[PDB]
Structures are given as C-alpha cells and as structure tokens.
Design a protein around this ligand. Structure first.
Ligand code: MG
Ligand code: MG
Ligand code: MG
Ligand code: ZN
Ligand code: ZN
Ligand code: ZN
Length: 143
RNA sequence: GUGCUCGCUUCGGCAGCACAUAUACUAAAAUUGGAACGAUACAGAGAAGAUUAGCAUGGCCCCUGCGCAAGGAUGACACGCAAAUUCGUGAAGCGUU
C-alpha cells in the first residue's frame, strides 16, 4: 500500500498536512507508468514521467522556500524518501534556471553539438512564434 | 521566468537592466524490396569389381564453433569430343607452260 518507506523512523512533524497531496501526486505517477503507448510516440510516452517528477519537486520546493511551511527535518525527509529531487531543486536556486523541466534539458553531453536543448532558449530570441516541444521533456520553453 | 531597479509608481500595468541562448537517425508513419533450410513430387555417398578410414588442393559455395582447434558424406563443387604458336616426303594418273 504505501510508498514503502526506507527509514523505519517515524516521519517528522509537518508530515500529515502534506500527505494527501503527495500521495495524490504519487497516484498520478502510478497512472502514468501504466499508460499504454498507442498513439503516443516513442519519445512522447516518457513525457508524463518528467512532468510529474517536476510537479512533485516543485511542490516541496514551494512549501519550503516560498510559503515557508515545512521545517528542515520534514524537507530533508521528503528528499531522502524520494518525493523531491535534490538536484533539480539545486538548479532552481540558480539565477536563470528557475522553471527548468529536467536535468536532461541542460545536459550538454546528451546533445550532438555539445549544447543545451532549444527548450532552454528564451522565447523572445526565436522571434517567430514557432511552436516547440523538446524531445527529451515535452517542454515548451523553460526560460 | 526570476530578481534588482532610491523606474514611472501603484501594489494594477509598463519601462530599463542582469541571468538564462538553439533538441531531434526530426514518425504515432506511408512506402519499398528480400529471405527462410519445413512439407510436397523427382531424386541416393569419393578413390579404374564390391565394401569402404580419411588428410589435403582452389575459390564470385558456404554452415556449426570464441577459435590461427575441430567437425559438416574425406562438407559440397571438380568427371573434361582435355588439340596453343608452327610442317613436310615418295610414287602414280590427268590437265597446263
Ligand atoms: Mg575436415
Ligand atoms: Mg567416409
Ligand atoms: Mg573438403
Ligand atoms: Zn528541453
Ligand atoms: Zn525538460
Ligand atoms: Zn523545458
């Protein structure tokens, strides 16, 4: 039934008020894992996973840095138990990197020419209104 | 998108600045051709009588094997009027100069 947790210590103080929605985000991830690929291209079928992973991480990020509604103990519990991404949070604290979808979309080893994805280009600098879905992510303009 | 703006200046909008700077064999396709060693009919082991161990040779024939081992019927093929340059003696008969 649970997330089966790997601490065996009781979860920290503010846990019971963020638990319905974390379990609701977790239910949404288990739906996306089982969606049968039919008219969903070979790269398009992994787009829900990066989106919900972004969503869970942004949820804990919004409660600890913006709303300030979680202590260090509860926050680091959620990172250890796999509800947030420590590395994606770490990029959102950088200056320009603040709606970043994926860690793939800034990885320069993953591209042909050693560069980011066009996901990361500012939308003013494309100048035309071309519509873009990043192949890694499905993103339409982080930046 | 975020933040700083002793920016207009409200907490609404806009202005400037800074940071952030180019994914993808681009398909969820449309097409396009070639193969298998299975049946189904005909077919039956090389060495000058017969029964036969084999080891090679050669390459527009390959198979099993990691193999520069070893096997595959000695793995198979090989069975061919197998003619390559280059001529002359002697006698006789007929016609001709
Ligand atoms: Mg042999
Ligand atoms: Mg024999
Ligand atoms: Mg042989
Ligand atoms: Zn991207
Ligand atoms: Zn992404
Ligand atoms: Zn993106």
């Amino acid at each position: 039934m649970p997330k089966v947790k790997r601490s065996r210590k009781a979860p920290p103080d503010g846990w019971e008020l963020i638990e319905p929605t974390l379990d609701e985000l977790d239910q949404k991830m288990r739906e996306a894992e089982t969606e049968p690929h039919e008219g969903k291209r070979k790269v398009e079928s992994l787009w829900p996973i990066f989106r919900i992973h972004h969503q869970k991480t942004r949820y804990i990020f919004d409660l600890f840095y913006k709303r300030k509604a979680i202590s260090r103990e509860l926050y680091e519990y959620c990172i250890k138990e796999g509800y947030a991404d420590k590395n994606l949070i770490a990029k959102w604290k950088k200056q320009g990197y603040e709606n970043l979808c994926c860690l793939r979309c800034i990885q320069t080893r993953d591209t042909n020419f050693g560069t980011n994805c066009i996901c990361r280009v500012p939308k003013s600098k494309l100048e035309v209104g071309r519509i873009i879905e990043c192949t890694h992510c499905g993103c339409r303009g982080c930046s």
